[PDB]
Each structure stands twice: as structure tokens, then as C-alpha cells.
């Protein structure tokens, strides 16, 4: 109940000064606790996750940095007092701490980038979710657009499609559709390196692949490459997250695990074809990123005279010969 998650949120406050007293409220917790694994332990998971949601709900950047440290001495004040169990990730809602970490480094990666075009796509993205208090206080806000920033990505995309409907593409309008590509990209670079220090999200990425495909149809050479090294930087983070979820699930209920394979395999084919017009100098890195997707790098070696590449492919491979 609410009386409990307000008692550990009170023991973490003292868990910054001393421990002894907090270690006896975790000791009173283990004896007074339920201790039936299947849901009462996911009743204290629903508490540790309701306080990670409140250390994320918390000088707007130096104030969001102070909150990635707070949620860092909150993940250390859980490892010690322990806090060595519970997990209610299920569907849509331990991986939930990391995820709320990753999205607080995303909140600081778009705080570090503040210009008039993103701040406008953000104000359009927040006025659409609800109204804002007009007692000044107009960021128009962030502390709740952090716990949910995933949404200011699918909307600062709908504000690049209405800024592309007026783009009239015309050159300065294909420079504004790349500036956003570069931010959603290095906001996905910031969640990757925060995991190294350990269906709307994805749609908005397959939507900007196709809009990064319509533009290189009319673009000065060099520019059409930098947005191609970018949509290659981004596609290599999606294929890496479907690989990591595969490896997460295995065995029984396999039927669902061989149906999600066909789905990622019909997309590394839809990202390959897309790169069939593009430069094949990136194929070598796309073929290595989803380190097999051989059918694509095998038909790039066939379209050219690089019988040297299909010999360099089979030189470093596990059963490609029986595949080629």
C-alpha cells in the first residue's frame, strides 16, 4: 500500500546520511514482509519502481544532472540494503531502472541541445498531450517530459513532416530535416553508452528512414552521404535491440521466438534493399552490425567485380561457404 512505499522513500532519505537505522527498516521489512514470490514480491517491485519514477519526476540541466546522481545513489542504496529480487517488467511496464536511467541521459542529451526549432517541436508536442500552466513556468516543461520523453520523439518527427510540407523541396529545408536526424540519433547514442556503463519508438525510426530516402533523391552529394551515415547509425541501434531481446528469450514458447525472427529478418532485408541504391561502403558495416544478414552483403559482392569481397566474406565466416 501507499504507507509502505512512503516508508522506504523515507528510509532512502536517511540512507544518504547513515545506514544503521535504514538497515533495520529493511530488516523489519523482511520479517514483516509477505514473502510469497509470485506477486507480493512484485508489490515491492511496484514500490521501487514508483520511487524511481519519482526521482525522475524530481537551471534546468544542472537540475536534471543532480537527478541522474540522485537515481544513482538510489540504485546504490538499493544494492546495499537489498533489494535483491522483485521484477514486474511484464508488458509495457530491474530492467525498468536501467530504462529510466537511459531516458534520463536522453533528457540531458536534448537539454544540451536547445535551439529554436526543437524547442518549437517540443512545445507542439506538449500542448498536444495536455494544456500548460501559463503562470510563466514555460519550458514549457521537462520533469514529466522525462519520465515520458519517448513521446517528444514521435512528435518532433510530426513537426519535421509539417515543416517538410512547407519545406517546398528548398536546400535550407533539407538542412532542417537533418538537424533533427542528428539529435534523435545522438540521443540514441546516449542510451547505448549508458548500457555500456551498466512499437511507436520503432515506427518513428522506420518513418525517418523513408524520409531520409526521399530527400537524397534531391541533395548535394556530400549531404546525401552524411544523412546516410546517420540513417546507418540509427538502423544499427534498432537491429542491435532486436538482437538483444532475441538473446533474452529462448527455448519453450519458441513459436513466438521464431516468428519474431522472421520479423527482424524481413526488416534487415527492408533496410538492405533501401541501402541497395545507397553506398555499399556502408554495407560492410551494416552486414557486420546485424553480423550475418548475409543475403544483402552477398548480393552486393555479386553486383560488383569483387570476387575478392566474397572471398573476404567466406574467409571470416562460420559456414558461409555452405551458404554462398
Amino acid at each position: 500500500k501507499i504507507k509502505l512505499l512512503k516508508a522506504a522513500f523515507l528510509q532512502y532519505c536517511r540512507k544518504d546520511l547513515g545506514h544503521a537505522q535504514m538497515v533495520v527498516d529493511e530488516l523489519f521489512s523482511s520479517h514483516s514482509d509477505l514473502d510469497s514470490d509470485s506477486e507480493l514480491d512484485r508489490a515491492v517491485t511496484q514500490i521501487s519502481v514508483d520511487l524511481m519514477d519519482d526521482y525522475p519526476a524530481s537551471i534546468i540541466l544542472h537540475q536534471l544532472e543532480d537527478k541522474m546522481k540522485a537515481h544513482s545513489f538510489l540504485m546504490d542504496f538499493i544494492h546495499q540494503v537489498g533489494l535483491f529480487g522483485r521484477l514486474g517488467s511484464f508488458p509495457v511496464r530491474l530492467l525498468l531502472c536501467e530504462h529510466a536511467e537511459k531516458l534520463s541521459a536522453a533528457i540531458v542529451l536534448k537539454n544540451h541541445h536547445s535551439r529554436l526549432s526543437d524547442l518549437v517541436n517540443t512545445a507542439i508536442l506538449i500542448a498536444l498531450n495536455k494544456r500548460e500552466y501559463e503562470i510563466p513556468s514555460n519550458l514549457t516543461p521537462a520533469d514529466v517530459f522525462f519520465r515520458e520523453v519517448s513521446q517528444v520523439d514521435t512528435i518532433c518527427e510530426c513537426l519535421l513532416e509539417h515543416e517538410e510540407q512547407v519545406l517546398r523541396d528548398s536546400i535550407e529545408w533539407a538542412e532542417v530535416v537533418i538537424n533533427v536526424n542528428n539529435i534523435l540519433k545522438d540521443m540514441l547514442q546516449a542510451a547505448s553508452h549508458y548500457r555500456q556503463n551498466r512499437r511507436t519508438v520503432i515506427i518513428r525510426q522506420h518513418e525517418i528512414v523513408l524520409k531520409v530516402a526521399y530527400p537524397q533523391a534531391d541533395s548535394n552529394l556530400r549531404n546525401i552521404v552524411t544523412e546516410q551515415l546517420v540513417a546507418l547509425i540509427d538502423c544499427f541501434l534498432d537491429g542491435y535491440v532486436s538482437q538483444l531481446k532475441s538473446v533474452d528469450k529462448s527455448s519453450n514458447r519458441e513459436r513466438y521466438d521464431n516468428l519474431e525472427m522472421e520479423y527482424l529478418q524481413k526488416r534487415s532485408d527492408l533496410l538492405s534493399p533501401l541501402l541497395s541504391l545507397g553506398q555499399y561502403l556502408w554495407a560492410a558495416s551494416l552486414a557486420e552490425k546485424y553480423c550475418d544478414f548475409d543475403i544483402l552483403v552477398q548480393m552486393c559482392e555479386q553486383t560488383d567485380n569483387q570476387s575478392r569481397l566474397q572471398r573476404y566474406m567466406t574467409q571470416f565466416a562460420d559456414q558461409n561457404f555452405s551458404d554462398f
Partner: protein, 89 residues
């Protein structure tokens, strides 16, 4: 005060990004209610918008300074306050 209030008067017609930016630079020049004005000015920052400038002044600052619910005391105020939680982050 006189300055901040005069830089924001309805008399100052061509008031642009720089007139408010400087009317938020003169707050450390005080020695009464700070955050009442912080609002007074961000609000005429919108009356002049005729729902562009709010946009820019959030582009010029680089944030839990501004208020919110207190503010509305509305479709693109929250809409810009979303790509203002991504900017600050």
C-alpha cells in the same frame, strides 16, 4: 524593476527576443517578489506572439525557472513545453 517593466510595456511595440532576454537579465539587479515577474514577462511574451518569440527566448537561454500550471493561471504552450523537456535534457 522600472527597466524590466518598461522593456515589457505595451508601449514598447517592436519588442523582440532581445528586449525580454534583457528583461530577464535585469533580475540579478534587484535586492520583492522575484518569480511573480518571471511570470509577468513570459506571459506578455505570449500576448505579443498572437497565437515565435517564446520559441527564440528558450533558444537564447542556453530551465526549471519558468513555471507551468501556475502559468495558465494552450495547445502549443504544452506543445512547446515538450520539446522543452527534450531540450533541457
Amino acid at each position: 524593476p522600472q527597466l524590466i517593466g518598461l522593456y515589457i510595456c505595451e508601449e514598447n511595440r517592436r519588442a523582440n527576443e532581445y528586449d525580454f532576454k534583457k528583461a530577464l537579465d535585469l533580475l540579478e539587479y534587484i535586492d520583492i517578489n522575484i518569480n511573480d515577474l518571471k511570470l509577468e514577462i513570459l506571459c506578455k511574451a505570449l500576448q505579443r506572439d498572437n497565437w515565435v518569440s517564446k520559441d527564440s527566448i528558450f533558444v537564447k537561454i542556453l530551465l526549471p525557472e519558468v513555471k507551468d500550471l501556475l502559468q495558465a493561471d494552450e495547445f502549443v504552450l504544452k506543445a512547446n513545453y515538450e520539446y522543452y523537456v527534450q531540450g533541457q535534457i
